[PDB]
Scaffold this active site. Sequence first.
Site, PDB file in Angstrom:
ATOM      1  CE  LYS A 350      15.341  -2.154  28.532  1.00 23.45           C
ATOM      2  NZ  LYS A 350      13.977  -2.081  27.946  1.00 23.45           N
ATOM      3  NE  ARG A 357       9.575   1.119  29.300  1.00 25.00           N
ATOM      4  CZ  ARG A 357       9.861  -0.020  29.927  1.00 25.00           C
ATOM      5  NH1 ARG A 357       9.024  -1.045  29.880  1.00 25.00           N
ATOM      6  NH2 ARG A 357      11.003  -0.144  30.579  1.00 25.00           N
ATOM      7  CB  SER A 399      11.409  -6.701  26.834  1.00 23.69           C
ATOM      8  OG  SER A 399      11.174  -7.173  28.155  1.00 23.69           O
ATOM      9  N   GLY A 400      13.977  -5.648  28.776  1.00 19.84           N
ATOM     10  CA  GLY A 400      15.025  -6.125  29.663  1.00 19.84           C
ATOM     11  C   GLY A 400      14.676  -7.526  30.149  1.00 19.84           C
ATOM     12  CG  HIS A 401      11.138  -8.718  32.755  1.00 20.47           C
ATOM     13  ND1 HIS A 401      11.286  -7.467  33.315  1.00 20.47           N
ATOM     14  CD2 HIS A 401      10.649  -9.515  33.737  1.00 20.47           C
ATOM     15  CE1 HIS A 401      10.903  -7.502  34.580  1.00 20.47           C
ATOM     16  NE2 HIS A 401      10.511  -8.734  34.859  1.00 20.47           N
ATOM     17  NE  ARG A 487       8.296  -6.458  32.093  1.00 18.21           N
ATOM     18  CZ  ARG A 487       8.185  -5.924  33.308  1.00 18.21           C
ATOM     19  NH1 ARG A 487       7.542  -6.570  34.274  1.00 18.21           N
ATOM     20  NH2 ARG A 487       8.765  -4.760  33.577  1.00 18.21           N
ATOM     21  CG  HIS A 493       8.491  -4.272  27.501  1.00 21.89           C
ATOM     22  ND1 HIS A 493       9.412  -3.360  27.038  1.00 21.89           N
ATOM     23  CD2 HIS A 493       8.914  -4.638  28.739  1.00 21.89           C
ATOM     24  CE1 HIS A 493      10.347  -3.175  27.955  1.00 21.89           C
ATOM     25  NE2 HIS A 493      10.071  -3.939  28.997  1.00 21.89           N
TER      26      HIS A 493
HETATM   27  O1  VO4 Z   1      12.538  -3.528  29.891  1.00 16.21           O
HETATM   28  V1  VO4 Z   1      11.218  -4.151  30.547  1.00 16.21           V
HETATM   29  O2  VO4 Z   1      12.365  -4.659  32.290  1.00 16.21           O
HETATM   30  O3  VO4 Z   1      10.284  -3.209  31.443  1.00 16.21           O
HETATM   31  O4  VO4 Z   1      10.852  -5.702  30.337  1.00 16.21           O
END
Ligand code: VO4
Length: 574
Positions: A350, A357, A399-401, A487, A493
């Site tokens: 990231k 974004r 994406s973190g998710h 997301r 995302h």
């Molecule tokens: O990086 V994201 O936690 O907003 O999916």
Amino acid sequence: VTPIPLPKIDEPEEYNTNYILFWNHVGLELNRVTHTVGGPLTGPPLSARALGMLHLAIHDAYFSICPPTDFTTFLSPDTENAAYRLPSPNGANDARQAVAGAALKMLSSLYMKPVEQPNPNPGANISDNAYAQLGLVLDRSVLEAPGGVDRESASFMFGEDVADVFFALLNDPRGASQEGYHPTPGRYKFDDEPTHPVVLIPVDPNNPNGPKMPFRQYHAPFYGKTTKRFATQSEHFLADPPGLRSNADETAEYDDAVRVAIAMGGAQALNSTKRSPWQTAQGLYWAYDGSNLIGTPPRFYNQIVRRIAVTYKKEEDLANSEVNNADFARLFALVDVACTDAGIFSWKEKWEFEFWRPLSGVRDDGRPDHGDPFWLTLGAPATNTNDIPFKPPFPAYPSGHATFGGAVFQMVRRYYNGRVGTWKDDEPDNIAIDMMISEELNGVNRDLRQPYDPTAPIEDQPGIVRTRIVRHFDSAWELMFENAISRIFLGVHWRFDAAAARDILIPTTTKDVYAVDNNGATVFQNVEDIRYTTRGTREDEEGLFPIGGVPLGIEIADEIFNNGLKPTPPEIQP
Ligand code: VO4
């Protein structure tokens, strides 16, 4: 102090008769409480790290006393390196008390007041109330623990020793530091959210009604490159995102991504929004964006894993079954370690690319026929609050998710393969679950009309109640997929932050341009047909690398699993 009234969890109360699940539960409670009071270990990467540390300590405490056959402990008692040397039971044979000591010690070290000077700089931002509330949780857990806690037993003391070792070895005090970081404006570059460019935070956390000060947050910009990995045996990398470096020529993909972003993730009432009501539900279902009484994504993933564990347990008795105890202790260590490392690498990438974004990308596009200078996203839900709070921002790719999901669910798939069904490790499984409820859509939590009141239960506070949606999923492959695309529905995302657009969307005759339905909504591939095969290039390295968070997570989980949950060799640590 007045204890915060926490809403009821949608889960069979029998689960907590098992001491491994109970302690996992305590970890999840601290997760949501710390995000309600603004205590330590907030945010997705660090909240994941806390659970990884908790389950590692539990794992070794239990398997030291009740030795496993097909694998071994994370650390060993014969390690010459003092930092990786596991304590010896020396007579201690009470696994229940060993787990209690490990769990209590670890959670206390993690959430209690840093009397050992650490309060300065690092903890200098958390109020005394936050710590007090967290303490209450810890204190009553001792009293709610199945079978009780005997703090004087040798076994309990052993567990504590185990926890001390893991805490000293893996704790990252300055993990979330942002000191010295500043955005570098430009196309494709991350910068302050146009909707939340600055926050007014109190000069003194203990006096929230007092004077405030302007503050600009950046969530853990140095964490990923400097932190100690847990069980990964190598560094993981992703292809350059469309528009940057070696892929700066992928304009068709980028342009179509902007198009999909507007149609699928815009605010509900915008004429340009084509997202369906059901898709809006899928978006909110997987949120857990650090809200009051809810916490972060790692909490939801653990809630789901708890159901899978009980649904597919070998023995019926949850209370007194060593087969179940060993199964849960092993599964949660594998899952939470994979989740921890997923956080590390997603955060590393990231901040490496610093990709912007969709909100900023669409607004600042610059082309009259492409961007929308006034666009608004559905956004990350600000549950149990009356406004839209400034949440510490961070870059979009990956994406973190998506990464968390890929790691967690691939770990579950590797662990149950041949037990729940049989499948190729890269093809859809059959690990189905029913009656899975998200706290984002449970008929209790809501969007308040006035500021949240921590002395009153959520039900007695006016607001629009979130519709209760009970879901069923056919596989961990589906969970992984939906968690990722959710997301896109929220508009936070890009499609490539989840996975390669080619692997999840329906293609057209035009390259990099995907299919839309009769009303303009983007069409996705059937879950059973999805394969994360499309890879790309990196400017700084030779070879092909995964695109998006899901593929990265899968990769991290396979590595950890294949190596049987072994520490990252200290030689390859940052
Ligand atoms: O990086 V994201 O936690 O907003 O999916």
